[PDB]
Structure 1
Amino acid sequence: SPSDFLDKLMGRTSGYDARIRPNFKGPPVNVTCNIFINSFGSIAETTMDYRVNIFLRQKWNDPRLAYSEYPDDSLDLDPSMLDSIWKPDLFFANEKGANFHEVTTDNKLLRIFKNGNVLYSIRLTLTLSCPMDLKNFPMDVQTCIMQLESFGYTMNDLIFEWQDEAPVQVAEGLTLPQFLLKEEKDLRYCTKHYNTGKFTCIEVRFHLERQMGYYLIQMYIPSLLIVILSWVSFWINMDAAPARVALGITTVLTMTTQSSGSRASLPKVSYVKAIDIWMAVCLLFVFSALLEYAAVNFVSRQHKKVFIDRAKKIDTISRACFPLAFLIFNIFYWVIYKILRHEDI
């Protein structure tokens, strides 16, 4: 009977203790753990964290759980008595609150192989934290990590190891809300040395690249429209002074409001950002246009002959020069932040 087999294998009469690691006072027990991402998203820079729904699985071996009576080489099992068998320790380093899922049943799958290998797959919901750098907000590349390491055992007793083929699988059709998950994934070791000793560790890196289209169409187009409107005002003659000054003031108002909104919709980072410098350049251009208009007005009332001609000449020269300066600054900014110093590694 299978129930008798379960009782004899790891039950009370089996003389097996779940509080003792396999191969006690001997070689350390190896673990081949792999994960399966089921969902992603909710990357909030305000809290500097993101959510995952991994399908964490663990593998190991122990001669005590090996069997030779039942004909089948792999039998399923239930979590209720899985609580009564040994489970290697595994906690995530950079996490801020994770929990299991208990919906209509337990979400733990336990399988025992004939050779003694044990398959342990359990469904988890995590909220990992990765620092975010905003050296170039619209065109940055984020690298959020997931560190797995033991807590109750050292390198002498427990070790970890990534699976050889397909270690970190991703569910087909998964799409990030804003970013995009690149195919390449980094796997390495993160062996930490606390005050208590040496602990084994496992690290996997995710390469996330932000998509510029949304931020472009929603923020850069209004600034370009405002500066072209400023040039349109620039083309206005000196007779309609109130209209020109009103247009300049309105442009500066729009620029300030857009900059405030853009910088308020983001975490308060100490250093400067690409969007911040772009909007500062646009604001400075609007300010310079208004200042030169004021200078033109001032020089118009300086006949107390050629003063009007000089004002017209300087207005025409500035109107011919400012768009070229804006174009060269824009192309320089785009090329530098696309190739020269960012989008590297």
Structure 2
Amino acid sequence: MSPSDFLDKLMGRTSGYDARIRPNFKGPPVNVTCNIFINSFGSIAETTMDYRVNIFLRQKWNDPRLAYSEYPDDSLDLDPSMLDSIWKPDLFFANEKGANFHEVTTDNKLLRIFKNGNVLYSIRLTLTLSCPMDLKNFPMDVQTCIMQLESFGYTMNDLIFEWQDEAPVQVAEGLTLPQFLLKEEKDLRYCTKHYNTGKFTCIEVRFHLERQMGYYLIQMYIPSLLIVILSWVSFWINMDAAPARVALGITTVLTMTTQSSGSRASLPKVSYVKAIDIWMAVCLLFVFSALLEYAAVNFVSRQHKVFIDRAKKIDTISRACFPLAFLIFNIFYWVIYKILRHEDIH
């Protein structure tokens, strides 16, 4: 007997199957087990506060109206053009801004009905999901992107979602990201919605993302640090070399300015202060203060033996004080952002 005629009898008008009535309509809620396989993961954008995934979504439930014994085969397959003939959960992604199915060559959908009446429903789909990002502590930030699977119009006494016990979320191997590192550890949560209509089932997965630091260190932090060190070389230059020390001071300020202005195009465009901005501002205040130190020495020197000794003391004190206070700033900045502000992801 052909499997298509058996499906016509099983879900036909003589069977009285109604795709608008959930299984076990009188009694206990439908339990739906969910798996997710992530094929790709990227397009993490701060301007729109979202990211993009391409996933396989598998749902399994039981429909006792679909149990069959007559047919020899253990499973039946429904055509992806007639999926509207069967009841399916009204799952939706609660933080989704845009999404689409896939249809090139045949429909990228699959549905199997087993003898006991269990239904397996696997689809492939692309999502744009919202994630709020902080971006304070920016070079050394860690973000948490979530994915929520909610029911649209069924309360928790009608429909319940559950994560599969063995392996609910899997990620394909070899994936890479231009900016982040997707950690291996993933959170499976329960975020049941309490509204006025009632309790609505919602399960959730959290992914942890750590930004890489090698580019920011090698292109922004170390060049700024070398410019700051270069500003300290004014203190070892002869006191009477005004064109040398003044030109070195102001050119160091200009170099500091071009370094920050060129860095500005690569950084995320936000309106609040980030850790990198704190670093750039302090390095600018350091090269600004090294030029004010020479302005003080140059003015105190010309007042016409005591004045020359007093001017030379500001130089020898500045030779130790400026590196020391920059060391203390370094210690504080790195501990605050690598240890204090750094917190458990959970």
For the superposition of Structure 1 and Structure 2, which TM-score range results when normalised by the shorter chain?
A: over 0.9
Deviations 1:233-280 (A, max 9, x none): 332223332232222222223333433454554445454321111111
Aligned-residue offset at 1:174: 1.9
User: Which runs of structure 2 are paired with 1:292-331 in the superposition (5 Å)?
Assistant: 292-303=293-304, 305-331=305-331
Following the alignment from structure 2 to structure 1, what is the Cα–Cα distance between the partners of residues 148 and 264? 32
> In structure 2, do the counterparts of structure 1 residues 75 and 24 end up closer, same or farther at CA, with 3 Å as the change threshold?
same
The SS at the match of 2:206 is strand
Quote the Cα distance in structure 2 between the aligned partners of 1:332 and 1:226: 20
1:83-123, Cα deviation, whole Å (9 max, x unpaired): 22111101111111111111111111111111100100101
Q: Deviations over 1:44-77 (max 9, x none)?
A: 1121111111111111111111111222212333
Distance 1:19 1:222 in 2: 65
Q: Distance in 2 between matches of 1:302 and 1:43?
A: 62
170-179 or 252-261, larger mean C-alpha shift: 252-261
Task: Please state how far the C-alpha of 1:321 moved relative to its aligned partner.
Answer: 2.1
- Which deviates more from structure 2 when the two are superposed, residues 225-234 or residues 165-174? 225-234
Distance 1:138 1:153 in 2: 43
| Kept in 2: contact 1:96–1:127 (CA 8 A) | yes
Secondary structure of residue in 1 paired with 2:310: helix
Q: Which string of whole-angstrom CA distances, capped at 9 and with x for unpartnered residues, describes residues 101-153 of structure 1? A: 11111111111111100100101100111111123111122111111100121
- 2:155 and 2:344 map into 1 onto residues whose CA distance is 37
Separation in 2, partners of 1:254, 1:219: 13
Distance 2:210 2:60 in 1: 33
Structure 1 residues 310-319 or 86-95, which shifts more?
310-319
Bigger shift: residues 4-13 or 181-190: 4-13
Q: Check conservation: 1:90, 1:148, Cα contact below 8 A.
A: yes
Task: Report the alpha carbon displacement of residue 220 of structure 1 after superposing the two structures with TM.
Answer: 0.3
Q: Is the 8 A contact 2:235 2:316 kept in 1?
A: no
**What is the TM-score normalised by the length of structure 2?**
0.93
Structure 1 residue runs of 5 or longer lacking an equivalent are: none
Greater shift after overlay, 225-234 or 47-56? 225-234
| C-alpha distance in 1 between matches for 2:24 and 2:141 | 48
Query: SS of the counterpart of 1:293?
Result: helix
Quote the offset at 1:193 in angstroms. Answer: 1.9
What is the DSSP-based 3-state SS (H/G/I as helix, E as strand, rest coil) of the residue aligned with 2:14? helix
SS for the counterpart of 1:169 is: strand
**What is the aligned-residue RMSD (CA, Å)?**
1.8
Whether contact under 8 Å (1:263, 1:276) holds in the other structure is no
Percent of aligned pairs with the same amino acid: 100
8 Å contact 2:32–2:161 — kept in the other structure? Answer: yes
For 1:9 and 1:261, locate their aligned partners in 2 and report how far apart those are by CA, in whole Å: 68
Which has the larger strand fraction? Answer: 2
The answer to whether the 8 Å contact 1:59/1:120 transfers is: yes
Distance in 2 of aligned mates of 1:22 and 1:132 = 40
Contact 2:111 2:119 in 1 (8 A): yes
- Counterparts of 2:142 and 2:161, CA distance in 1: 29
Which of 294-303 and 123-132 deviates more?
Answer: 294-303
The count of corresponding residues between Structure 1 and Structure 2 is: 344
Aligned pairs for 1:30-49 within 5 A: 30-49=31-50
Q: CA deviation at 1:14?
A: 3.2
Contact 1:140–1:343 (CA under 8 A) maintained in structure 2:
no
Deviations 1:287-339 (CA, angstroms, capped at 9, x unpaired): 11011111111112222x33223222221221232112212321232123212
- Deviating above 6 A after TM superposition, structure 1's stretches of 4 or more consecutive aligned residues are none
In 1, distance between residues paired with 2:251 and 2:129? Answer: 44
Greater shift in the superposed pair: 307-316 or 107-116? 307-316
| Contact 2:3–2:76 under 8 Å retained in 1 | no
